[PDB]
Scaffold this active site. Structure first.
Site, mmCIF file in Angstrom:
data_model
loop_
_atom_site.group_PDB
_atom_site.id
_atom_site.type_symbol
_atom_site.label_atom_id
_atom_site.label_comp_id
_atom_site.label_asym_id
_atom_site.label_seq_id
_atom_site.Cartn_x
_atom_site.Cartn_y
_atom_site.Cartn_z
ATOM 1 N N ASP A 11 0.813 -1.218 0.000
ATOM 2 C CA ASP A 11 0.000 0.000 0.000
ATOM 3 C C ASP A 11 0.853 1.278 0.000
ATOM 4 O O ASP A 11 0.651 2.175 0.826
ATOM 5 C CB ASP A 11 -0.918 -0.002 1.230
ATOM 6 C CG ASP A 11 -1.625 -1.333 1.422
ATOM 7 O OD1 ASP A 11 -2.227 -1.842 0.439
ATOM 8 O OD2 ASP A 11 -1.576 -1.879 2.550
ATOM 9 N N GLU A 197 -11.326 0.348 -1.721
ATOM 10 C CA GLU A 197 -10.432 0.908 -0.706
ATOM 11 C C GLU A 197 -9.252 1.592 -1.385
ATOM 12 O O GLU A 197 -9.192 1.643 -2.616
ATOM 13 C CB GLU A 197 -9.937 -0.193 0.244
ATOM 14 C CG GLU A 197 -9.011 -1.224 -0.410
ATOM 15 C CD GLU A 197 -8.635 -2.362 0.532
ATOM 16 O OE1 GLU A 197 -9.133 -2.387 1.682
ATOM 17 O OE2 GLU A 197 -7.841 -3.239 0.118
HETATM 18 CA CA LIG Z 1 -3.033 4.923 0.338
#
Ligand SMILES: [Ca+2]
Ligand SMILES: [Ca+2]
Ligand SMILES: [Ca+2]
Length: 441
Positions: A11, A197
């Site tokens: 991420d 997300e």
């Molecule tokens: Ca991020």
């Protein structure tokens, strides 16, 4: 010949300081590079001695206690006007949206970061941050922030994962906390436990759109993770895909969990699982950030990815982003190796290509490239029948599978044959991407 040095940062959230690029990811992981190709690992997990926060378990104890976790999820680090570095950190129990989101600040980008406090929570059994009882069908999981300045110098934070959707809050430019009276902020997309997300918002000065990047599906190799994008003239929306569908209305069916069928028709899907010639390839590429370089005018997509046959192993990848004639960004098919846009002529682009059709589904399937030819006469033959033309400096238009695709040609390094190749990358109004990589060098 290009040289790469790999790092593992789940991420990744990009930030440039002091002429050096940093990525900050989950598990308090981070890496840096000056060229976006040769990364150096700085940190990898949450433990005593992590240089970013060496006393992490004490420093963020309230967050670990609330989330009932011993790790951190996907952060953002952003430099505010005081020149300090503001880390938006978060932890989540993992089996439910039991999470806390807080702020820590460092003088130096590599730490140490000092906790300023938790400012959002989810998964409480009781009154939520908007005053109504917490309800994960309508309230966010307070994770995955991206804090950014808009072109007017207003500070925003977009965030969320699954649960009630993706939300955006206006932030205080001096303290780094949300302005009062907002609750969870304004929803941009989602609801009813949609698999969406990793929001990230990037403005492009040429098109004057804000682009909302996001990941659909699940991060694991069986999850069909895929990066999608939508756009708005405003940082806080409303965001629309290339068919003009309103992202605010996209969500799973009432009473369902992880309803992929309801959300997959929407957004512009930039990249899914693929393998050119069954050599290497990506599985669940996603949770991106993105960077626009004012000096060069280049843009970059920064993300992690898994790989065919390599289980859950992941590394950071960087691909150049190009801009098609309609003002939608297209991903260059190969990782960044210093290449730049150039004028191409017809003879440059004529020839055989491996074609990847990413489609518009959420799918864990690894899609194999198939051979086509861009013929001199403007016809496409081979795996598909269609037409094509090159326009302007380096634009492509293709007609395949009942759709029209607008994209960009780019000479790139192919790291599987160690050779320069011609590529194209294009998008249809319907929101699906096609990539070509030439058989010829
Ligand atoms: Ca991020
Ligand atoms: Ca082949
Ligand atoms: Ca459609």
């Amino acid at each position: 010949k290009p040289v790469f040095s790999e790092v593992t940062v789940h991420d990744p959230s990009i930030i440039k300081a002091n002429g050096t690029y940093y990525v900050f990811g989950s598990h308090l992981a981070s890496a840096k590079s000056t060229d976006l190709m040769n990364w150096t690992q700085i940190s990898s997990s949450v433990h005593d001695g992590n240089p970013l926060i060496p006393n992490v378990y004490e420093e963020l104890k309230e967050t670990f206690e609330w989330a009932e976790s011993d790790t951190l999820w996907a952060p953002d680090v952003t430099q505010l006007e005081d020149g300090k570095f503001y880390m938006y950190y978060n932890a989540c129990r993992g089996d439910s949206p039991r999470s806390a989101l807080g702020l820590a600040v460092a003088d130096d980008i590599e730490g140490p970061y000092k906790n300023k406090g938790i400012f959002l929570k989810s998964g409480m059994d009781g009154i939520s941050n908007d005053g109504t009882p917490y309800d994960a069908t309508k309230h966010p999981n307070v994770v995955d922030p991206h804090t950014f300045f808009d072109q007017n110098g207003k500070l925003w934070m977009v965030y969320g994962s699954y649960s009630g959707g993706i939300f955006i809050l206006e932030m205080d430019k001096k303290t780094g906390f949300p302005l009062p009276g907002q609750g969870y902020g304004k929803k941009l997309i989602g609801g009813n436990h949609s698999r969406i997300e990793g929001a990230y918002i990037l403005y492009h000065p040429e098109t004057q759109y804000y682009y909302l990047y996001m990941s659909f599906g699940g991060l694991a190799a069986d999850g069909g993770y895929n990066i999608r994008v939508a756009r708005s003239k405003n940082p806080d929306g409303p965001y629309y895909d290339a068919e003009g569908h309103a992202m605010i209305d996209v969500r799973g069916k009432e009473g369902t969990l992880f309803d992929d069928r309801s959300i997959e028709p929407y957004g512009v899907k930039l990249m899914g699982n693929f393998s050119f010639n069954n050599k290497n390839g990506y599985v669940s590429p996603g949770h991106n950030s993105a960077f626009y370089d004012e000096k060069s005018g280049k843009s970059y997509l920064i993300f992690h990815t898994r790989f065919p046959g390599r289980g859950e192993e992941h590394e950071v990848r960087v691909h150049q982003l190009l801009m098609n004639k309609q003002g939608w960004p297209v991903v260059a098919p190969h990782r960044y190796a210093g290449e730049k846009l150039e004028k191409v002529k017809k003879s440059d682009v004529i020839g055989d290509y491996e074609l990847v059709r990413h489609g518009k589904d959420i799918s864990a399937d690894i899609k194999e490239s198939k051979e086509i030819r861009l013929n001199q006469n403007g016809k496409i033959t081979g795996a598909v029948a269609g037409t094509w033309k090159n326009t302007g400096h380096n634009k492509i238009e293709l007609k395949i599978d009942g759709k029209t695709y607008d994209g960009v040609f780019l000479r790139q390094w192919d790291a599987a044959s160690e050779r320069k190749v011609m590529t194209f990358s294009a998008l249809s109004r319907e929101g699906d991407a096609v990539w070509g990589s030439s058989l010829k060098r």
